[PDB]
Amino acid sequence: IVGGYTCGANTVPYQVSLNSGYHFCGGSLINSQWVVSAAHCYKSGIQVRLGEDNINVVEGNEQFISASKSIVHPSYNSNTLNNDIMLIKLKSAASLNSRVASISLPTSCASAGTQCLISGWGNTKSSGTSYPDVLKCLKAPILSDSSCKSAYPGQITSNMFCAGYLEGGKDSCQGDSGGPVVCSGKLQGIVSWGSGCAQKNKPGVYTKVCNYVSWIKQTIASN
Ligand SMILES: N=C(N)c1ccc(CNC(=O)[C@@H]2CCCN2C(=O)CNC2CCCC2)cc1
Ligand SMILES: [Ca+2]
User: Fold this and answer.
1) What is the 3-state secondary structure (H, E, C) of 128-166?
2) Which residue ranges are tagged as binding site for Ca(2+)?
3) DSSP state of 209
4) What is the Cα–Cα distance from 27 to 22, expressed in whole angstroms?
5) Domain containing 126 — which CATH number?
6) I want to staple 144 with a disulfide (CB 3.0 to 4.6 A). Which of 10, 112, 154, 158 is the partner?
7) Which structural domain range is residue 80 located in?
8) Torsion sign, CA atoms 87, 29, 177, 26
9) Count of domains observed in the chain
10) Cβ of residue 52 lying under 6 Å from some atom of ligand 1
11) Between vectors from CA 210 to CA 137 and to CA 163, what angle results, nearest 5°?
């Protein structure tokens, strides 16, 4: 997160860290046994880290649980990043508490101008690299369909939206991938892609979760 702020410990209790001996992606807890993340975050050997603030110190409240299943959308395309969504089943259920909590799926899609909360342990620099120890936060609005397509012509599918700031300076970045965009208490986005980070006229692009609620339920119910 570039241009954001320190969230404060466990203020984003649905935020998880995907760990393979290092933080590599975020995700969102949607019930005691399932996480939503990005298909481009897929790999073998994922450990889901719940309850985290400082990812480099065991502070208390952490739950580390291996993934038992990682289910990438069968229509994911790694070139266009269409259908950039993955479900992870935990090997054991998480113990839910004030520090480890699920986030609701949407009942409907959000509209342009909706303010959302984006969070993660990704890069904090728009030029070069700096990676934080504690969780960072950014409030960002959803942009219009047309502004999104005018920024990234021929690259925005019906399964994507843009959010952020065209003037630059405030954005998600590498290492925030797979993490949440939460609007009015609902998970509406997944951190997916963009050109650079926090660059003028290049907002962030997010997977449109409302298009996947039925797929998520249907897939969890059969797994
Ligand atoms: N500016 C952001 N909001 C942002 C940008 C990138 C990420 C992480 N995702 C990525 O790095 C993904 C994975 C595959 C390549 N990719 C892309 O973002 C590549 N950038 C595209 C290429 C042409 C137009 C812009 C996360 C956030
Ligand atoms: Ca920790």
Assistant:
1) CCCCCCCCEEEEEEECCHHHHHHHCCCCCCCCEEEECCC
2) 52, 54, 57, 62
3) G
4) 15
5) 2.40.10.10
6) 112
7) 13-102+211-222
8) negative
9) 2
10) no
11) 40
CA 100 to chain centre: 16
Question: Would you say the CB of residue 177 lies under 6 angstroms from ligand 1?
Answer: yes
Compute CA distances 184 → 114, 156, 166, 219, whole Å.
8, 24, 23, 25
- Write the Ramachandran bin of 10: left for phi over 0, alpha for psi from -120 to 50, otherwise beta: left
Q: Tell me the CA–centroid distance for residue 172 and ligand 2, in Å.
A: 21
* Rounded CA separation 122/25 (Å): 8
- Supply 122's token pair: 């990704």
Query: How many Cβ atoms from other residues are within 10 Å of residue 189's Cβ?
Result: 30
Residues 18 and 8 in one domain: no
Cα separation, 171 vs 153, in Å, equals 20
164 shares a domain with 76: no
Domain check: are 107 and 8 in the same one?
Answer: yes
Residue 59, token pair as written in the block = 């502070």
